[PDB]
From Swiss-Prot, chain A:
GO terms for biological process: proteasome-mediated ubiquitin-dependent protein catabolic process; regulation of protein catabolic process. GO terms for cellular component: cytosol; extracellular exosome; extracellular region; ficolin-1-rich granule lumen; membrane; nucleoplasm; nucleus; proteasome accessory complex. The keyword Iron does not apply. The modification Phosphothreonine is found at residue 19. The lineage of its organism: Eukaryota, Metazoa, Chordata, Craniata, Vertebrata. Residues 5-16 have a biased composition (Low complexity). This is 26S proteasome non-ATPase regulatory subunit 2. InterPro entries: 26S_Psome_Rpn1, ARM-like, ARM-type_fold, Proteasome/cyclosome_rpt, RPN1_C, RPN1_N. The gene is PSMD2.
Curated annotation (Swiss-Prot), chain B:
It comes from the Eukaryota. GO terms for cellular component: cytosol; membrane; nucleoplasm; nucleus; proteasome accessory complex; proteasome complex; proteasome regulatory particle, base subcomplex. GO terms for molecular function: ATP binding; ATP hydrolysis activity; proteasome-activating activity; RNA binding. The chain holds residues 93 to 432 of 440 of the full protein. GO terms for biological process: proteasome-mediated ubiquitin-dependent protein catabolic process. It comes from Homo sapiens. It is found in: Cytoplasm; Nucleus; Membrane. It is linked to Birk-Aharoni syndrome: An autosomal recessive disorder characterized by failure to thrive, severe developmental delay, intellectual disability, spastic tetraplegia with central hypotonia, chorea, hearing loss, micropenis and undescended testes, as well as mild elevation of liver enzymes. This is 26S proteasome regulatory subunit 4. Keywords: Acetylation, ATP-binding, Cytoplasm, Deafness, Intellectual disability, Isopeptide bond, Lipoprotein, Membrane, Myristate, Nucleotide-binding, Nucleus, Phosphoprotein, Proteasome, Ubl conjugation. Component of the 19S proteasome regulatory particle complex. The 26S proteasome consists of a 20S core particle (CP) and two 19S regulatory subunits (RP). The regulatory particle is made of a lid composed of 9 subunits, a base containing 6 ATPases including PSMC1 and few additional components. Interacts with SCA7. Interacts with NGLY1. Interacts with PAAF1. There is a cross-link at residue 143 (Glycyl lysine isopeptide (Lys-Gly) (interchain with G-Cter in ubiquitin)).
Length: 686, 330
């Protein structure tokens, strides 16, 4: 209505006129007013006025919150100490107290670093718990620990909405927009409320992120207390890293209450369900071994047929197609074909001894060295195959234990903080053989042993490989694959200053500066650190044409989750190294049609290194439209690397470190075929 | 920089726009013009020579006609096919489940689920040819939309693209054959086949040449061609044996029940009132396709949306039905 009767009531500054006029404003305050509260120019005198002064503060914060104010709205409430499903409380509490306490917690959170804001935050916490509008009062009260008592104060019955919604979007925006320590608060407090609640597998992902030994204990006594089994053993062994399965088998071997978690703690019970169920319900066609094993020649496509042959591990015909197939094969193919028996015998532990024994202690050194490589690939928890490769260990020039050191130390790194493998690896790195893959599989071995360690120890292991890395400045491939293992030890954390320690004791000529930028690659697994994204764009134009490839190749690891920002204008540039950066930065994801388009444009190229590098990620990202790119390569080629690599693309076609290390080691294929002898022993495949 | 800005003498004032005929492996190509001047000069930079697709307009000069570069130029190719994946699947329409599983089973067996296709050893890479009496893209695109779920698609609507220009010939069919060659996992869809129904002497020879190149005399199993016309009597009997060789089916008359199902599908997502009857809607119609009922569902949702409401009343849907009653009678 008109302001004729009530307009001359706010002008008198008398106490009774306020103590009866203000209750009328609380009565008519159900919808605020008839208009946008144009009475500011008349109540700004009441601003100076003060019996029921808390009501004057309430109406004052009501009108100042009604039109506009940045700091003066929550002052009448922090001084008021409010004591005096409708529309009134919804309007003055929900939105006005939402933005009100939001800007109070923002101003008091950014300006100063008492308890009045905590009382306001708990009061609004309870009132909005009554309002029952989730994720909005939550999405505003994220930045104010108080979040622990907030979640344990709120997570009592509402589990699906706060867990699913709050944990989903707050976890996504907690790895995207929230820094590390508050994410650690998400991990600990989520361990609390999720420990008191159900849905153990999400707490198991909280063990994939926490990597704590208590979570697996409480979830094994609680998952053991709450009665399938082999399946949660399967993804139990998949989600766990290198540390907590060794520690898990030592604490379960310390308790030995049932030994079923000891049985599930190893690779045996993750493979005994899969192999028979896979051979039974699936039937692969024989035209791939029969044809892809027939169009091979030139002693390289036949190697691609040893890899496609290694795809089997149903049909074991091409495996058992007589003998002399390895005898006709050359060294580059004697090692790969020697490891083919290891790729095809991932299961059948007892049969592996009687299948590889025929090639053990043979006449050719590479047959038995690749046979020990096979013995290391076939198993990872049996540990009863290492002895006739750890025994000798004494060549110092060449006595078949350097190649057996390649296959056995690499396969042992795949299947090995074990002290009595590194006490023996000390003369391995200290040997300094001219063979690149000695320090290659050594740094990759101890590196894959040191993944997820105690925050990346900087002991005399990586200090020793750094001193002996800078021992001699020859064969820079050593400087290309030693930062592989160095980064494998630096991997697992981003905030560590150990990368700056490498910036202290490592910085030198651009060789060890490329080592330092590799430590920069693997020491930034990913967080909200866009400073390294603008720094990435800044150092993106460096003259050195390899730290662009690796330091810019880190893109697929840094933003591996938010895949909407990963596509950029890297393909629109003119440097072929950048085209390689995007081409490798595609990844092994589900392979949407946009990625297939990026391979439809990146595929057509003239350089054999890029045309050789495109089918790897093209066929890794798609594991209908599978045979079209193969026909495209048949139309382009019809060199040797394109044909062997396209048959290897027939192999590929049809957050753990095990799926990250192999291809990152494979990023140095632009060299002699010695690297292609380590290409055949990748473990990132599924 | 100077080597990039030194070839400006060739692309300067003495410059012309010619028409290239073909590219010779001897690095000297043959061009043409209004009088057909054939000049062969060794190629230069700025040219691609692979994606150039000879037979188009290129850049010439008043000089000895050394090719200094190329200039690309066809908007009609863009409106040929759609590159999106519509959500309309084979399970969104009913009544013709056998009629849709005949084409789904016909062209979804090659290149997909191949154990019933490559083990037999037949490979008839010709595909079925259908025809819809209502047509207007609704029935023929509602049958062809089954292949559009997860696959590359190729669409050709109307014979106007041949008749809207001079008699260039089957070169456009060769463009569809090379883009289909580079896009083998696709489905060729020819819609609104009215070449002979709409010089006229050249239409018959480019249609018989369309039958020649469509037969695939030199190519193996590469793509499944699905043709779709409106009247089966317009096509000559010669376009059958070299054309439809796999299978064909007939479409029933959409009088009351097929229009009731089309009305249900077009009114499944929308919200209508309780008093909205169906007998008058399936009674007032007479030989109508789905484009006009979709048009009155669109203007009915917008007209009812004028009052900021999503519910379509009966009087407003009859007021929109007057557009159906008038349009077919006009």
């Amino acid at each position: 209505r008109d302001k004729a009767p009530v307009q001359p009531q706010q002008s008198p500054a008398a106490a009774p006129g306020g103590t009866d006029e203000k209750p009328s404003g609380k009565e008519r305050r159900d919808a605020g007013d008839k208009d946008k509260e144009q009475e500011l120019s008349e109540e700004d005198k009441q601003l100076q006025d003060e019996l029921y002064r808390p009501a004057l503060e309430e109406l004052r914060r009501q009108i100042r919150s009604s039109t506009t104010s940045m700091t003066s709205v929550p002052k009448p409430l922090k001084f008021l100490r409010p004591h005096y499903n409708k529309r009134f409380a919804a309007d003055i509490i929900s939105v006005l107290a939402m933005t009100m306490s939001g800007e109070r917690e923002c101003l008091k959170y950014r300006l100063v670093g008492a308890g009045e804001v905590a009382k306001e935050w708990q009061e609004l916490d309870d009132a909005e718990k009554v309002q029952r509008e989730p994720l909005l009062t939550l999405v505003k009260e994220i930045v104010p620990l108080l979040m622990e008592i907030e979640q344990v104060d709120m997570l009592e019955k509402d589990i699906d909405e706060n867990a699913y919604a709050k944990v989903c979007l707050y976890l996504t925006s907690c790895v995207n927009y929230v820094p590390e320590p508050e994410n650690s608060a998400l991990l600990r407090c989520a361990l609390g409320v999720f420990r008191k609640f159900s849905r153990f597998p999400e707490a198991l992902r909280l063990a994939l992120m926490l990597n704590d030994m208590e979570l697996v204990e409480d979830i094994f006594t609680s998952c053991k207390d709450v009665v399938m089994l082999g399946r949660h053993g399967v993804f139990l062994e998949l989600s766990e890293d290198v540390e907590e399965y060794e520690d898990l088998t030592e604490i379960m071997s310390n308790v030995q209450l049932n030994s079923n978690f000891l049985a599930l703690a190893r690779e045996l019970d993750i493979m005994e369900p899969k192999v028979p169920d896979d051979i039974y319900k699936t039937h692969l066609e024989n035209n791939r071994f029969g044809g892809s094993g027939s169009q091979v020649d030139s002693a390289r496509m036949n190697l691609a047929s040893s890899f496609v042959n290694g795809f089997v591990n149903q049909d074991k015909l091409l495996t058992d197609d007589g003998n002399k197939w390895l005898y006709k094969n050359k060294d580059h193919g004697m090692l790969s074909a020697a490891a083919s028996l290891g790729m095809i015998l991932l299961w059948d532990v007892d049969g592996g001894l009687t299948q590889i024994d025929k090639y053990l202690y043979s006449s050719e050194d590479y047959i038995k060295s690749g046979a020990l490589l096979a013995c290391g690939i076939v198993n990872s928890g049996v540990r009863n195959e290492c002895d006739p490769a750890l025994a000798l260990l004494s060549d110092y020039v060449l006595h078949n234990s350097n190649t057996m050191r390649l296959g056995s130390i690499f396969g042992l790194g795949l299947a090995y903080n074990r002290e009595d493998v590194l006490t023996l690896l000390l003369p391995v790195m200290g040997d300094s053989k001219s063979s690149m893959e000695v320090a290659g599989v050594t740094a990759l071995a101890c590196g894959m042993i040191a993944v997820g360690s105690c925050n990346g120890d900087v002991t005399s292991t990586i200090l020793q490989t750094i001193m002996e890395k800078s021992e001699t400045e020859l064969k820079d491939t050593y400087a290309r694959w030693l930062p592989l293992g160095l980064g494998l030890n630096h991997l697992g954390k981003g905030e560590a200053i150990e990368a700056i320690l490498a910036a202290l004791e490592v910085v030198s000529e651009p060789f060890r500066s490329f080592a330092n930028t590799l430590v920069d690659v693997c020491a930034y697994a990913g967080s909200g650190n866009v400073l390294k994204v603008q720094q990435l764009l800044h150092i993106c134009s460096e003259h050195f044409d390899s730290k662009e490839k690796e330091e810019d190749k880190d893109k697929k690891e840094k933003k591996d989750k938010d895949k909407k920002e990963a596509p950029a204008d890297m393909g629109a540039h003119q440097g072929v190294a950048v085209l390689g950066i995007a081409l490798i930065a595609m990844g092994e994801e589900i392979g949407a049609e946009m990625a297939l388009r990026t391979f439809g444009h990146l595929l057509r190229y003239g350089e054999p290194t890029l045309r050789r590098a495109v089918p790897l990620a093209l066929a890794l990202i798609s594991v209908s439209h599978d045979a079209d790119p193969e026909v495209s390569y048949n139309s382009i080629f019809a060199a040797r690397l394109a044909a062997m690599l396209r048959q290897l693309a027939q192999y590929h076609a049809k957050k753990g470190t095990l799926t990250l290390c192999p291809y990152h080691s494979d990023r140095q294929l632009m060299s002699q075929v010695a690297v292609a002898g380590l290409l055949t022993v990748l473990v990132s495949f599924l | 920089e100077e080597e990039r800005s030194k070839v400006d003498d060739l692309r300067g004032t003495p410059m012309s726009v010619g028409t290239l005929e073909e590219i010779i492996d001897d690095n000297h190509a043959i061009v043409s013009t209004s009088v057909g001047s054939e000049h062969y000069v060794s190629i230069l930079s700025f040219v691609d020579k692979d994606l150039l697709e000879p037979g188009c307009s290129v850049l010439l000069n008043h000089k000895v006609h050394a090719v200094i570069g190329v200039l690309m130029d066809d908007p009609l190719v863009t409106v040929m096919k759609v590159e999106k994946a519509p959500q309309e699947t084979y399970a969104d329409i009913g009544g013709l489940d056998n009629q849709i599983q005949e084409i789904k089973e016909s062209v979804e067996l090659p290149l997909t689920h191949p154990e019933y296709y490559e083990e037999m050893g037949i490979k008839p890479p010709k595909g079925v040819i259908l025809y819809g009496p209502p047509g207007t893209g609704k029935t023929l695109l509602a049958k062809a939309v089954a292949n559009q779920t997860s696959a590359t698609f190729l669409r050709v609507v109307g014979s106007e693209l041949i008749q809207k220009y001079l008699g260039d010939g089957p070169k456009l069919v060769r463009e569809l054959f090379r883009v289909a060659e580079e896009h083998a996992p696709s489905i060729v869809f020819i819609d609104e086949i009215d070449a002979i129904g709409t010089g006229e002497r050249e239409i018959q020879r480019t249609m018989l040449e369309l039958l020649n190149q469509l037969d695939g005399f030199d190519s193996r199993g590469d793509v499944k061609v699905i043709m779709a016309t409106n009247r089966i009597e317009t096509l000559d009997p010669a376009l059958i044996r070299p054309g439809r060789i796999d299978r064909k089916i007939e479409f029933p008359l959409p009088d009351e029940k097929t229009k009731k199902r089309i009305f249900q599908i077009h009114t499944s997502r929308m919200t209508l009132a309780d008093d909205v009857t169906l007998d008058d809607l399936i009674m007032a119609k007479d030989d109508l396709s789905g484009a006009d009922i979709k048009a009155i569902c669109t203007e009915a949702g917008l007209m009812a949306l004028r009052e900021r409401r999503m519910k379509v009343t009966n009087e407003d849907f009859k007021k929109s039905k007057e557009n159906v009653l008038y349009k077919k009678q006009e």
